[PDB]
Ligand binder design. Structure first.
Ligand code: LMB
Ligand code: GNP
Ligand code: CL
Ligand code: CL
Ligand code: CL
Ligand code: MG
Ligand code: MG
Lengths: 131, 196, 1012
């Protein structure tokens, strides 16, 4: 006699190509200054159906998205004058805050090595997205 | 769908900075005194669904106080802020509490000691006991370093929804679709000495 | 727009429009809400707006409109009441009283407009504070009378009385003059007998009503101040501890009342009163056990469930039990019939202590400390609590928070990682837990050992194995170091280490290894006594720490470095001597292999390693041997240095990093060696100062070629790091130097030559605040020996730094702080330097001091006030000489007025005590006739007029113009009091506080300043 026993991130279809801790800034053009957007893990995610690679970054603790955009082939990583461990680039369509919006981002890392590794991986992703 | 939250405390304790950090991720270094009140919606995603706080960030300076306790009307929760580097701000906590609970008789309230990132702390941990008899939750926080920055909202969400096991969860991440760049490149990033 | 109509007072107030604006503000959003807010604030702040209040109260259909009208009135009453014609005072009183009566008599309104009624009650209380009892003698009798006519009115009267009590006794200190507070306290005290009668009658005749709760709420306030006889000579304690504990609606407030009762002023020889104190506690504990939960109940689970008001209740029970017992447990310890009660109350505390809630745990832990500290000393007590203490041992050991030293933690992925940041908010918690556990160990060392060793057995056998469990245990074990005898400690530590070693063998993988390693490092670092007695063991421990310095786990690696220096700080003597059966002192072995040992460490970790070596080396007190050890230690950085100095004489980013790390290494070693560092400093000093100059030139060149933005570049930041570290090295050495003659004769002139002109002749953005910091230590240590050097320092930094910081309060924050520290020490140590200044520069110095005390930044503000006080003292000490006479003629009234300004502007409340001290000094100089010359101009006042008379005239005029709403008599009376009290700081300060109250309102009573 068997006794009767007692009674969605959207990231499930994606491969993590690369992950690194980072601080993200957005450039306020009007007031000519950089503003922090979030600190946390920056991931490169490859969609297993479309093979398209995006940047997805979430803030520590609250887990709120601070970057969500395709790593476009036409983007270019440029240095910031103040830093040897950061890149700046223009993004034409980021959907972190909802509607697609253009930004000038800067992303800073724990070290130059991390920044350099990121650049390499970034450019790898661009080639994937080209195919 | 939403809860009215009033944020009170002495001028310069970091109320507006704390809220801004939560709204946009930014850290505002400049002290621009709040004039009366500023209202901001703030949403968190939890395992029990979205919770929306309508944050009434009030002026701490007497000369900019505006409607004062008039702001507290129908608040469902609150944060009382002080600055652990300024003893007078802790001394004034009972005054803010008094004015608040006279209007809001039975709401969950979190007491926050801000600026714990600053080396020379003045309000000793052992001194902070006002919350005990008043049934306030207490946290050491820093809007600058983000130390415990999520705790006040997490506690409040748990009390308001009535679920001790409520947790923040990751938002769903929907598929995503000139030489102002030169200015950006030649404007130094702030706080280049920080770990990140 | 439409909404702005209410701001036009030339037209009648459209109440419909007001209500729309108010609704838009409270229930609207976005731009509209923001516009409405601004309109309402302007409306509220209009000085005739109070004249619209009655109209709003009569005709409005919006409760928030009426609230705002009451706020407008509140502002009028608290600030301008005595400015009103009397008929307007009578009128406002009548329509507030009438509105309250009207709202209470309509049941629907009473039930549904609590916010508005409460606001009305507070507004009435503001009127009472102005009018009562002198112009309202029958308020209390009539309040009492009205209570019998209606339950609604009776209830609301309880709210009024509660608020009144708060405003008079709880919140008067900051908001009323000493005289007015006394008047109101006396007035309430005189009529309390009748207030209590009403209160008690209500409590007798009711059980669970809103009226009962309101009455108890008022009682809670009264207990802050009423005589104990109202509590002990009536039957009120029985009612509180029985009847009102039974009903949950009254239980919350009743428990708070009983907590305050437990704090009443109470005779200590009165057997009867002792009986009553035992009885109410007994009653209360009985009600808890029968109506709420038995002593065996799982309060941890109850709290976590968070039903209804359970968390608040349990919080309040903790507060009640800890408050009562801390004061009264002695009453329960001797009578065998009270033993069960004593232990039951403590058992509830044990259960409460298991609750997961940090702030609650701190409250119970505070009580446990109170208990165990008492049991440690008081004869024949500890045995009573042996069962309670045994349970408490378990609670503490199982809830030990991570020590600051343990740098590994589990992340959300289940990985044992290095912490991101320090857990700053658990530093005090750990200290508090350690303190109780130490006491508990002393109280029964056998029990504690048995608990720990057996818990350890269940880790190794597997039954209770978890990171959480091995952690808390290990932390607890480390935390009791010092509590055992050396012999017991020996056996105990041995057993613990073997078990941890065994545990490491059995639990493999990088996560398990990191946890067990963190725990062993913690324990061994906590027992240096043991280490000192067990050389073989110590040596092997250190060698293992060296292995961990090659760990790919960064947490373990970093902890190994900290553990190494922690051990060395206590055990250094054992590294410096040649141990039995060793071929050399271990320090020799350490220095030799330093390159290999530190190869995988980050630079700051390498510097920590070198600093630890410095600690050991300074144990060698024979000079020749110590200097050789130092030379040996510095071999690698000195070789790197020598080659860089050679090449520099013939600066890419890699070289700049190498240089910075060389100097940082020297700073590290100098920090631990202090005075003993001198020979190493001598090896690098002159070439180091030459490098400072070379680096300064490169920075200047880069700024010239690239612009100010250059200072943000990695290159320039690296060059400035070199300069900063050189300054830090010199500062560090001079702060610790014992041979000050060498400092002056060898170090100082080359330093000043290298740093001062460079600072002066750089653009503001290229100046290092660290220069000022270095100079402060120079002046502090040898200022008395280098008067011309101090003058040079002032000339080079004073005016140019002042110009950087005197345009606002925010720019160059580090320069600001260091600048005033430097001025403070120069003023203290080498005052002559200021005497040497030209008059225009000395004027700037006075300006700079006053500028400092207008800062809200405490660093600056405090130093500014201190400089001012020290300056006055310096001038006074000169006696009757031209310089002092000119100083007073030029600056006495500037200091007096500037001090008054910051005292009275409400933006510098943190500085009150030091401000008051400075003012008192300044006033006492005149009333002691320590100022030789007349302060007044030749024809300003009649010849031969005393400075006392002229000071009063000056101050009266100053205050008359600055505070024109004050009466002449108010100002005269204040000044009379203040000047008379200029030898009595405590009283002087009270008079200042009274003045600060009076300036906020109209018609303050001038006799207030006669307060004794
Ligand atoms: C993993 C263990 C493993 O995989 O084997 C852990 C995490 C280790 O990597 C870390 C070990 C650490 C310290 C050890 C405690 C260092 C070992 C010292 C040692 C074995 C010393 C010898 C010479 C002894 O003295 C032994 C024989 C003695 O029995 C000791 C253990 C007890 C004493 C002193 C007895 C006595 O009578 O004196 C991380 C710092
Ligand atoms: N170091 C440090 N500074 C902080 C922190 N939070 C805020 N500040 C600083 O404190 C200053 C005042 O902050 P702000 O948020 O305007 O304070 P406020 O309580 O809103 N003032 P008001 O009541 O007048 O509107 C700002 O310069 C801000 O950068 C913190 O956690 N750490
Ligand atoms: Cl209302
Ligand atoms: Cl030693
Ligand atoms: Cl007068
Ligand atoms: Mg603000
Ligand atoms: Mg060269």
């Amino acid at each position: 006699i068997h006794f009767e026993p007692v009674v969605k991130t959207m990231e499930e279809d994606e491969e993590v190509l690369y992950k690194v801790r980072a601080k993200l800034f957005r450039f306020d053009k009007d007031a000519k200054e950089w503003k922090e957007r979030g600190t946390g893990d920056c991931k490169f995610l490859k969609n297993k159906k479309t093979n398209k690679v995006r940047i997805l970054m979430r803030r520590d603790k609250t887990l709120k998205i601070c970057a969500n955009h395709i790593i476009a082939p036409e983007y270019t990583l440029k240095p910031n004058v103040g830093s040897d461990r950061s890149w700046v680039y223009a993004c034409t369509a980021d959907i972190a805050e909802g509607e697609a919006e253009a930004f000038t981002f800067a992303i800073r890392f724990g070290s130059k090595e991390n920044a350099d590794k990121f650049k390499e991986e970034f450019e790898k992703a661009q080639e994937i997205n080209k195919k | 769908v939403q809860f009215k939250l009033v944020l009170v405390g002495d001028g310069g304790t970091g109320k507006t900075t704390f809220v801004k950090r939560h709204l946009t991720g930014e850290f505002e270094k400049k002290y621009v005194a709040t004039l009366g009140v500023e209202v901001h919606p703030l949403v968190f995603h939890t395992n029990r669904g979205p919770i929306k706080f309508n944050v009434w960030d009030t002026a701490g300076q007497e000369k900019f106080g505006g409607l004062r306790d008039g702001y507290y009307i129908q608040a469902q929760c609150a944060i009382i802020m002080f600055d652990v580097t300024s003893r007078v701000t802790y001394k004034n906590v009972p005054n803010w509490h008094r004015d608040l609970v006279r209007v809001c008789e039975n709401i969950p309230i979190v007491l926050c000691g801000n600026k714990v990132d600053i080396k020379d702390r003045k309000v000793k941990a052992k001194s902070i006991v006002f919350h005990r008899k008043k049934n306030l939750q207490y946290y050491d926080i820093s809007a600058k370093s983000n130390y415990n920055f999520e705790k006040p909202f997490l506690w409040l969400a748990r009390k308001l929804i009535g679920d001790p096991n409520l947790e923040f969860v990751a938002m769903p991440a929907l598929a995503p679709p000139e030489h102002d760049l030169e200015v950006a490149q030649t404007t130094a990033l702030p706080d280049e000495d920080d770990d990140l | 727009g439409a909404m702005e109509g209410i701001l036009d007072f030339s037209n009648d107030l459209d109440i419909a429009l007001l209500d729309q604006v108010v609704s838009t503000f409270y229930q609207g959003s976005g731009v509209q809400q923001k516009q409405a807010q601004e309109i309402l604030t302007k409306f509220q702040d209009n000085p005739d707006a109070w004249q619209k209040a009655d109209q709003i109260l009569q005709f409005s259909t919006n409760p928030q409109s009426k609230f705002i009208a009451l706020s407008i009135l509140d502002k009028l009453i608290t600030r301008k009441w005595k400015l009103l014609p009397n008929d307007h005072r009578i009128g406002i009183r009548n329509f507030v009283v009438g509105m309250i009566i009207s709202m209470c008599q309509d049941d629907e309104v009473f039930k549904t407009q609590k916010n508005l009624i409460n606001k009305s009650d507070l507004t009435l209380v503001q009127i009472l504070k102005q009018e009562w009892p002198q112009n309202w003698p029958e308020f209390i009798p009539e309040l009492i009378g009205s209570s019998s006519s209606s339950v609604n009115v009776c209830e609301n009267n309880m709210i009024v009385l509660k608020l009144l009590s708060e405003e008079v006794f709880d919140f008067s200190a900051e908001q009323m003059t000493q005289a007015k507070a006394l008047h109101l306290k006396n007035s309430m005290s005189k009529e309390f007998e009748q207030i209590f009668k009403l209160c008690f009658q209500v409590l007798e005749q009711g059980s669970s009503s809103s009226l009962i709760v309101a009455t108890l709420e008022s009682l809670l306030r009264y207990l802050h101040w009423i005589p104990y006889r109202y509590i002990y000579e009536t039957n009120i304690l029985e009612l509180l501890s029985t009847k009102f504990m039974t009903s949950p609606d009254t239980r919350a407030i009743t428990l708070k009342c009983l907590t305050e009762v437990s704090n009443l002023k109470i005779p200590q020889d009165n057997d009867l009163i002792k009986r009553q104190t035992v009885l109410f506690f007994q009653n209360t504990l009985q009600q808890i056990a029968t109506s709420v939960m038995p002593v065996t109940a799982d309060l941890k689970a109850t709290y976590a469930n968070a039903n209804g008001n359970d968390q608040s209740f349990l919080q309040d029970l903790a507060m009640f039990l800890t408050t009562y017992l801390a004061r009264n447990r002695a009453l329960l310890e001797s009578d065998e019939s009270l033993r069960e009660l004593l232990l039951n109350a403590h058992q509830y505390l044990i259960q409460l202590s298991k609750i997961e809630e940090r702030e609650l745990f701190k409250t119970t832990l505070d009580y446990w400390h109170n208990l165990v500290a008492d049991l440690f000393y008081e004869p024949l007590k500890k045995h009573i609590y042996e069962e309670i203490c045994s349970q408490l041992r378990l609670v503490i050991i199982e809830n030990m928070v991570r020590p600051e030293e343990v740098l590994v933690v589990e992340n959300d992925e289940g990985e044992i990682v290095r912490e991101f940041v320090k857990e700053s908010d658990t530093i005090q918690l750990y200290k508090s837990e350690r303190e109780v556990l130490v006491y508990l160990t002393h109280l029964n060392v056998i029990d504690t050992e048995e608990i720990m060793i057996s818990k350890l057995a269940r880790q190794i056998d597997g039954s209770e194995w978890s990171w959480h469990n091995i952690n808390t245990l290990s932390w607890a074990i480390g935390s009791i170091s010092g509590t055992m005898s050396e012999d017991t400690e020996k056996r105990f530590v041995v057993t613990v280490i073997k078990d941890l070693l065994d545990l490491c063998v059995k639990k493999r993988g990088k996560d398990n290894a990191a946890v067990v390693a963190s725990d062993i490092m913690y324990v061994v670092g906590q027992y240096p006594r043991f280490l000192k007695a067990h050389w073989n063991f110590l040596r092997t421990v250190i060698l293992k720490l060296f292995e961990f310095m090659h760990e790919t786990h960064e947490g373990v690696q970093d902890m190994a470095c900290d553990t190494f220096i922690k051990i060395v700080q206590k055990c250094k003597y054992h590294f410096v001597i040649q141990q039995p059966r060793e071929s050399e002192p271990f320090i020799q072995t350490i220095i030799r292999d330093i390159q290999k040992t530190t190869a995988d460490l980050q630079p700051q970790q390498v510097h920590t390693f070198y600093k630890a070596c410095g600690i050991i080396i300074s144990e060698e007190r024979s000079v020749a041997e110590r200097n050789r050890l130092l030379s040996d230690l510095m071999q690698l950085p000195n070789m790197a240095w020598d080659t860089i100095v050679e090449q520099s004489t013939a600066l890419d980013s890699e070289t700049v990093k190498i240089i910075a790390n060389i100097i940082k290494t020297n700073v590290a070693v100098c920090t631990s060696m202090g005075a003993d560092f001198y020979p190493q400093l001598g090896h690098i000093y002159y070439n180091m100062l030459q490098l400072y100059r070379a680096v300064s030139s490169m920075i200047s060149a880069q700024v010239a070629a690239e612009g100010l933005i250059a200072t943000k570049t990695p290159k320039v930041r690296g060059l400035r790091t070199i300069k900063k570290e050189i300054l830090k090295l010199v500062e560090t050495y001079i702060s610790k130097a014992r041979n000050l003659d060498d400092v002056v004769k060898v170090l100082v002139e080359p330093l000043l030559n290298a740093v001062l002109e460079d600072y002066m002749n750089n653009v503001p953005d290229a100046r290092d605040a660290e220069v000022l910091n270095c100079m402060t230590t120079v002046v502090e240590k040898v200022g008395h020996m280098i008067p011309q050097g101090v003058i040079l320092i002032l000339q080079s930094v004073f005016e140019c730094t002042l110009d950087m910081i005197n345009k606002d309060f925010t720019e160059y924050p580090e320069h600001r702080v260091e600048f005033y520290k430097l001025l403070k020490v120069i003023n203290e140590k080498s005052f002559a330097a200021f005497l040497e200044l030209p008059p225009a520069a000395f004027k700037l110095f006075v300006d700079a001091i006053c500028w400092a005390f207008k800062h809200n930044n405490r660093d600056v503000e405090v130093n500014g006030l201190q400089i001012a006080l020290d300056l006055v003292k310096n001038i006074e000490r000169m006696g009757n000489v031209p310089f002092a006479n000119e100083f007073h003629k030029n600056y006495f009234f500037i200091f007096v007025s500037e001090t008054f300004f910051v005292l009275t502007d409400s933006d510098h409340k943190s500085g009150f005590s030091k401000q008051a001290l400075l003012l008192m000094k300044l006033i006492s100089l005149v009333y002691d006739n320590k100022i030789s010359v007349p302060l007044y101009q030749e024809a300003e006042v009649p010849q031969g007029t005393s400075n006392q008379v002229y000071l009063s005239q000056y101050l009266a005029n100053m205050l008359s113009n600055a505070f024109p709403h004050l009466t002449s008599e108010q100002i005269a009376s204040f000044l009379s009091a203040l000047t008379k009290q200029c030898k009595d700081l405590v009283v002087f300060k009270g008079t200042l506080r009274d003045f600060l109250v009076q300036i906020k309102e109209v018609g303050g009573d001038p006799t207030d300043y006669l307060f004794a």
